[PDB]
Design a protein around this ligand. Structure first.
Ligand SMILES: CCN(CC)CCNS(=O)(=O)Cc1ccc(F)cc1
Ligand SMILES: CCN(CC)CCNS(=O)(=O)Cc1ccc(F)cc1
Ligand SMILES: *[C@@H]1O[C@H](CO)[C@@H](O)[C@H](O)[C@H]1NC(C)=O
Ligand SMILES: *[C@H]1O[C@H](CO)[C@@H](O)[C@H](O)[C@H]1NC(C)=O
Ligand SMILES: *[C@H]1O[C@H](CO)[C@@H](O)[C@H](O)[C@H]1NC(C)=O
Lengths: 533, 538
């Protein structure tokens, strides 16, 4: 019995497992329950604290993946499979993972909590790209990741009902955060230094913890990679959630909110997932059926209203985007696009893709989009049209929401650092035209290149080490700058006046000004005036 | 006769003329100034189409410029050259339908291609007698026959009650056409070739050239066309029948007025002293505005069979050769005539607030939403409050909306419809310019170079400006002669390629050799020419 692998938490005893990282051992405690299994009649309900247990609970393996849709577009293809569930699917999935160095920290150590993305319809903390061992072994961090309910199970809502009040997947996260507050000290973690970080839907979740008062006492800093609580895809109104839930019920034969939710509770899990995509009001991409809902509770108002009026002093936040946010989504619904060819399109197809990429746009607004993104020097060149379609999607859904959030935070007291990630992995399995797709910074932040068997390049390794530095230095301090590197250039804070941000790639940090400034003014300032009138 | 210069005596359809031997720096030229081409449009002829001049007896003295057509005179900066050089330099009169002719001295052996100049000035002003329109340099240096005519401006030229007999509108343009017919009949007696006639003009003169292209009876009167900083399409050059009616009716009220209605109204207007009409001209504009002119050509279904926009979209322009272009800072001149914050006597650094106010004035026809779109497009979002950027952006809104984008629309529409198009941007600021630096190269300041004024040593231009002026004179005349501004022998010199839809090439005109550029302010003009109409159409 290795006494390093033995921990007592408020619920009982755990045995972890000692894992090998290239630099040495780490302690991993995987599959720790933080909630009672949200099964049977607990479906759609807020999570409850895990009841205490007897003896020593085995925490040496990843627990099950929250029940979710599994992608089928490219069966067996690594670029898609890497995001697919790598454990068995179950509604019994409320478990979290903790990595710490071996031996466990002598002093209270800063905590990074990872919240996975996946459009609020998918994801799991057990994926290889979320492997905590590198950050724990190299930077000596305590790293925590939890599972939270996705799809219908996490976000199906009949707003105002007692038995599907919505946002329970967010409460899943929030409960994990309390668990960390109550227990992390036993692992060597410093509960008074907790940094949330997440990507895509995970970034949006982090954003909603910023905006939801009861979460604020459970963390001190936040990182939002490629995602925001504001924006077109991350929330729905109460009216729209009620519409989609009522529609899905009709679709599965169901049938008072109580009775509708009761029949839904009788339904096998896959019966709900089978119809998940069928409740979107328009044919669209970068749109998800069951996401957080403006309930007047977890979200007191819309994210837009909350960022416009919130007070963010004593908050430090790190935000950014990858070079080609939109490319990934095009192969999933836009005619003309495939990963198996260069996806050179016509003007007509670009017009049609915009109605799909901006599904809520009036004829006029879509006209405005096409006219903005067209290169009038080369209005018909397929290579431009292709790259612009990608840009429309990326800017509409990520880049401009990020710039909007960065802006409101800095202006309202927050300390903000912005990046754009521009390195494309040598190992990337997607075609060249997709550039640096949504999601491909993660393997670097988590330190995967340090694994020699992964066949990354020497420079990609040096680069990954630099990113792990920025992230952990940010966790430690709220400032991603190494306090030992006495070298210009430094990473400056994003402000409303200078609007500085840095590029992350193989070359040294470069300071740029204005994050898609003109093009985001179009999305952030002009379009909303339009679609109204 | 007997004891006068036998080279200055010429007969035209209406009678005998005595011209004058002028000195240009490189030699003498023949000028025939103040040749009448129409009966005086005075009395019961005010507002009427011109009647051709009745033959005179004896030798008409044609040694002096004739009266300037009755017009508003600028009072913004009194005694200031930058303003006064455009003001009338002869007596104002409704009796003003005269034309001028410069030819080599002695007159040419073989028939010589003719250039006809149509002055600009918003259709409310102008005169062929101004210094910057002096044909002596082009005549002496290039051997050209140059003709400039006076045409009626303002109320006298463009007041219309559409459909009536007594004020059908567009009579100012009919004055021009009649001068063009005069050239066809008479120019051969000066050594001019009526089979090679090239129109050129700047601003409203440019737009006039455009309208002759679009009007059928004009088409047989010329062969090639040059449009400098102006277009018949665009927001200022025409008005609907309804709008011209409204403006004419309003102006009548302001002066005391009041066959049936229309006949009596116009009859009353003809009892008014010319100055009374001029004094109320600016008061009929629907909004507070710059780059808008009260009395302009009207879309009448006659001279203009439809809107210029419709005509250029749906026209056949096979075998038409056009040179078009713009100056670097089309809008700056206009800001000092209306937009608060702007003056020639300071740097005109404006606030964001002043910019927003200025946009409403420079784009007076815009809804609040359209106005918003303009402000959002022209704002620098890295420096949205920088007074220098807002200053220059104001100038660019006005210049793009009124000139640069209409020209781009015209050029692309013509090139796609068969025309041979050549396009330029004029970027040289005269060393002698009296306007401030901030105004850059303003509207109208290529003209003195096209006409070769830097060849006058007394004018104090630089040596490089002389060489530059000579290049431009060659471009324009080579184009007049061939339909191609390039010198057929000088392949060593960089070439001026035609403007196409595919490549959108144009050239820079400055002290340096020709530089070819692609894209006539393409993104920004897609905004004005494609998006903006869709908005206001909702
Ligand atoms: C790349 C990283 N990403 C987030 C973790 C995983 C993919 N999920 S996605 O939302 O990004 C794109 C997608 C959307 C709808 C759909 F049906 C299939 C895929
Ligand atoms: C500079 C060249 N230009 C055309 C020849 C001179 C005419 N002035 S203008 O029509 O261009 C601008 C203007 C408008 C209203 C006003 F009251 C006074 C001036
Ligand atoms: C320039 O002069 C004009 C007129 O006097 C005035 O409206 C404007 O405020 C002045 N601007 C500056 C920069 O002083
Ligand atoms: C690949 O691209 C072509 C057009 O370039 C498109 O027709 C096709 O749908 C794409 N993929 C496949 C193989 O279906
Ligand atoms: C330029 O030449 C001299 C320079 O002082 C001067 O006497 C003359 O008047 C100037 N010419 C003009 C047109 O200003």
């Amino acid at each position: 019995e290795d006494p390093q692998l033995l921990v007592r938490v408020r619920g009982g005893q755990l045995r972890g497992i000692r894992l090998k990282a290239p630099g040495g051992p780490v302690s991993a405690f995987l599959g720790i329950p933080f909630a009672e299994p949200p099964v049977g009649s607990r479906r759609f309900m807020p999570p409850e604290p895990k009841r205490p247990w007897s003896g020593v609970l085995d925490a040496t393996t990843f627990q099950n993946v929250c029940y979710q849709y599994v992608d089928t577009l490219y069966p067996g293809f690594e670029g898609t499979e890497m995001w697919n569930p790598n454990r068995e699917l179950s509604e019994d999935c409320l478990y979290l993972n903790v990595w710490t160095p071996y031996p466990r920290p002598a002093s209270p150590t800063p905590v990074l909590i990872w919240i996975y993305g996946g459009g609020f319809y998918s994801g799991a903390a057990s994926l290889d790209v979320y492997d905590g061992r590198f950050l724990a072994q190299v930077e000596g961090a305590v790293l925590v990741s939890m599972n939270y309910r996705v799809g219908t199970f996490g976000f199906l809502a009949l707003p105002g009902s007692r038995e599907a009040p919505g946002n329970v997947g967010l409460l899943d996260q929030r409960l994990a955060l309390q668990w960390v507050q109550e227990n992390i000290a036993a692992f060597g973690g410093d509960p008074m230094s907790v940094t949330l970080f997440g990507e895509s839907a995970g970034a949006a979740s982090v954003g909603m913890h910023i905006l939801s008062l009861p979460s604020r006492s459970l963390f001190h800093r936040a990182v939002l990679q490629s995602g925001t609580p504001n924006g077109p895809w991350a929330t729905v109104s109460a009216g729209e959630a009620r519409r989609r839930a009522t529609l899905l019920a009709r679709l599965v034969g169901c049938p008072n909110d109580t009775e509708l939710i009761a029949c839904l509770r009788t339904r096998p899990a896959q019966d709900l997932v089978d119809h998940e995509w069928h409740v979107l009001p328009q044919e669209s991409i970068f749109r998800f059926s069951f996401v957080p809902v403006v309930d007047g509770d977890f979200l007191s108002d819309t994210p837009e209203a909350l960022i416009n009026t919130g007070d963010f002093q004593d908050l430090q936040v790190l935000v950014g985007v990858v070079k080609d946010e939109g490319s990934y989504f095009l192969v999933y619904g836009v005619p003309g696009f495939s990963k198996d060819n260069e996806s050179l399109i016509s003007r007509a197809q670009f017009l049609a893709g915009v109605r799909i990429g901006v599904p809520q746009a009036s004829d006029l607004a879509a006209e405005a989009v096409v006219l903005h993104y067209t290169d009038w020097l080369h209005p018909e060149d397929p290579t431009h049209l292709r790259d612009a379609m990608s840009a429309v999607v990326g800017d509409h859904n990520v880049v401009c929401p990020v710039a909007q959030l960065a802006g409101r935070l800095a202006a309202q007291g927050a300390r903000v650092y912005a990046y754009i990630f521009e390195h494309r992995a040598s190992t990337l399995t997607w075609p060249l035209w997709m550039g640096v797709p949504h999601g491909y910074e993660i393997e670097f932040i988590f330190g995967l290149p340090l694994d020699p068997s992964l066949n990354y390049t020497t420079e990609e390794r040096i680069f990954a080490q630099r990113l792990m530095k920025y992230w952990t230095n940010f966790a430690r301090t709220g400032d991603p700058n190494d306090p030992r590197d006495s070298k210009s250039p430094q990473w400056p804070p994003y402000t409303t006046a200078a609007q500085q941000y840095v590029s992350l790639n193989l070359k040294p940090l470069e300071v740029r000004r204005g994050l898609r400034a003109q093009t985001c003014a179009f999305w952030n300032r002009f379009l909303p005036k339009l679609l109204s009138a």
